[PDB]
């Protein structure tokens, strides 16, 4: 199952 | 950076004339991901060719498996044609039953 | 008997027209179970293993929603990075991301990871302690400072040590018939005369799983690397792998050479010798 939050660079 | 692809052409199972099999062309260690891979039958491109989903190794270089269902004969010749930004001209790797 | 779950993401910009090409794949050990391709018609996360199709609608809806959020972040990143590196807008670039967790033989959390690359080189990665970051250059440095202030590591650590491991165990159980089974390599040797005085012996390892394996040649009980050739492990295409090692030897002396095979599916290493 994928992670929920993905911060931008 | 750019990385030239390594090429391996082989069948899924030990080659046997008249026996249905799978012809594979494994390209790996390349970058960028855009690449042109074709399986050839007696110098001619095969249409029914599929490939795995783009993935990569620890060093970030990519790898893809192209494959087609085929039936080897004593005469028919098979090969894999590969073209990439790092290549001056398309590379051709002929299929060897013993490799 | 350690195991792992990993997600790979690749985004390629297309300056000529449209959005970047986005491709994501999910794996459990050496078995792919999901994928997403922005070029595909479904625009949904799709199954690539039988045991994953057991999941209900909420699963696929949630995974689809999340993977799309991943692609948009990568789209934004490609733009942000073009600026950091002061690059033209006419060229195509690549961002890659990989993250996941491992469980030890005790099936308990072992380690987690989250790495990032730009144009095929390391950019920024979470250290094994899952609290600090490794930045490859000054562009990555700016990202590091921003993620430290936003406490991005803390959020990832909660996932990697918790959610990640919990689902890995769930998948291992649901697909135990394959995921928890080892396929011992099927081996044999071929003989090919290269001249009237030399011959090539090729040691084959076929249909094995997982991919990890070691093939070694010995001459009169001693390891030999001279006059040998080892090809990289390759996928058979049916979920298993293949590999072979060859050595050139003097015709008539084939008996001095032995091929040793080490693999998880072998109670003890196998030794092969020509007939």
The boundaries of the domain holding residue C145 are 1-181
Inter-residue contact C28 to C5 (CB < 8 Å): yes
Inter-residue contact C227 to C201 (CB < 8 Å): no
Contacts B86 to C, Cβ<8 Å = none
Strands of C165-252, DSSP E? 186-193, 198-208, 214-219, 222-223, 228-230, 234-235, 241-250
In whole angstroms, what is the distance from residue C211 CA to residue C98 CA?
A: 19
Residues 6+ apart with CB under 8 A from C228: C217, C245, C246, C247, C248
Phi-psi region at B77: left, alpha or beta (left = phi > 0; alpha = psi -120 to 50): beta
What is the count of structural domains for chain C?
2
The answer to whether domain B1-99 has CATH 2.40.128.280 is no
For residue C116, being part of any structural domain is answered with yes
Cβ–Cβ contact C126 with A under 8 A: no
Phi-psi region at C237: left, alpha or beta (left = phi > 0; alpha = psi -120 to 50): left
Q: Could you say which of C159, C181, C203 is where a domain stops?
A: C181
Q: Could you say which of C127, C150, C181 is where a domain stops?
A: C181
Bridge partners (DSSP) listed for residue C193: C199
Contacts B70 to C, Cβ<8 Å = none
For residue C94, being part of any structural domain is answered with yes
Bridge partners (DSSP) listed for residue C266: none
Whether C48 and C174 share a structural domain: yes
Of C152, C158, C96, the C-alpha closest to C126 is C152
Q: Do residue B55 and residue C94 have CB atoms under 8 angstroms apart?
A: no
In whole angstroms, what is the distance from residue C145 CA to residue C129 CA?
A: 17
Residues 6+ apart with CB under 8 A from C129: none
Whether C93 and C160 share a structural domain: yes
In whole angstroms, what is the distance from residue B79 CA to residue B42 CA?
A: 8
Whether C120 and C64 share a structural domain: yes
In chain B, what are the domain boundaries? 1-99
For residue C2, being part of any structural domain is answered with yes
Residues 6+ apart with CB under 8 A from C241: C30, C207, C208, C209, C210, C211, C213, C233, C234, C235
In whole angstroms, what is the distance from residue C108 CA to residue C106 CA?
A: 5
Whether C256 and C160 share a structural domain: no
Whether C96 and C222 share a structural domain: no
Whether C233 and C132 share a structural domain: no
Q: Do residue C232 and residue B67 have CB atoms under 8 angstroms apart?
A: no
Inter-residue contact A3 to C153 (CB < 8 Å): no
- Residue C113 has, within 13 A of its CA and on its CB side, a CA count of 17
Inter-residue contact C73 to A7 (CB < 8 Å): yes
For residue C102, being part of any structural domain is answered with yes
In whole angstroms, what is the distance from residue C139 CA to residue C145 CA?
A: 10
CATH number at residue C264: 2.60.40.10
Q: What are phi and psi of B93, to 5 degrees?
A: -120, 110
CATH number at residue C3: 3.30.500.10
Contacts C94 to B, Cβ<8 Å = 31-33
Angstrom resolution of this structure: 2.2
Q: Could you say which of C163, C181, C199 is where a domain stops?
A: C181
Whether C36 and C100 share a structural domain: yes
Whether C83 and C206 share a structural domain: no
Whether C166 and C223 share a structural domain: no
Of C270, C265, C33, C63, the C-alpha closest to C172 is C33
Q: What are phi and psi of C166, to 5 degrees?
A: -60, -40
Taken as a whole, chain B contains a residue count of 99
**Omega of the bond prior to C210 within 30 degrees of 0, cis?**
yes
């Amino acid at each position: 199952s994928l992670f929920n939050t993905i911060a931008v660079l | 950076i750019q990385r030239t692809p390594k090429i391996q052409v082989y069948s899924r199972h030990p080659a046997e004339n008249g026996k249905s099999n799978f012809l594979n062309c494994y390209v790996s260690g390349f970058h960028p991901s855009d690449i042109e891979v074709d399986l050839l039958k007696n110098g001619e491109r095969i249409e029914k060719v599929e490939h795995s989903d783009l993935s990569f190794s620890k060093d970030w270089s990519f790898y893809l498996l192209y494959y087609t269902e085929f039936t080897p004969t004593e005469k028919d010749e098979y090969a894999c044609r590969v073209n990439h930004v790092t290549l001056s001209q398309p590379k051709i790797v002929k299929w060897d039953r013993d490799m | 008997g350690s195991h792992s779950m990993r997600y790979f993401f690749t985004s390629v910009s297309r300056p000529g027209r449209g959005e970047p090409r986005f491709i994501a794949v999910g794996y459990v050990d050496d078995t792919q179970f999901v994928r997403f391709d922005s070029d595909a018609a479904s625009q949904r996360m799709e199954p690539r293993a039988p045991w994953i199709e057991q999941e209900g609608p909420e699963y696929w809806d949630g995974e689809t929603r999340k993977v799309k959020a991943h692609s948009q972040t990568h789209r934004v990143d490609l733009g942000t990075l073009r600026g950091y590196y002061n690059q033209s807008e006419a060229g195509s670039h690549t961002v890659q991301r990989m993250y996941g967790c491992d469980v030890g033989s005790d099936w308990r959390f072992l380690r987690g990871y989250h790495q990032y690359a730009y144009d095929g080189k390391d950019y920024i990665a979470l250290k094994e302690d899952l609290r600090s970051w490794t930045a490859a250059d000054m562009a990555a440095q700016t990202t590091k400072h921003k993620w430290e202030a936003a406490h991005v590591a803390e959020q990832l650590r909660a996932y990697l040590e918790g959610t990640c491991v919990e689902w890995l165990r769930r998948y291992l159980e649901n697909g135990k018939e394959t995921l928890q089974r080892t396929d011992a390599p099927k081996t044999h040797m071929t003989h090919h005369a290269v001249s009237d005085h030399e011959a090539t012996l090729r040691c084959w390892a076929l249909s094995f799983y997982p991919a990890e394996i070691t093939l070694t040649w010995q001459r009169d009980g001693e390891d030999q690397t001279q006059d040998t050739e080892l090809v990289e492990t390759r996928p058979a295409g049916d979920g298993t792998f293949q590999k072979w090692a060859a050595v050139v030897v003097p015709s008539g002396q084939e008996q001095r050479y032995t091929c040793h095979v080490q693999h998880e599916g072998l109670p003890k290493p196998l030794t092969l010798r020509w007939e």
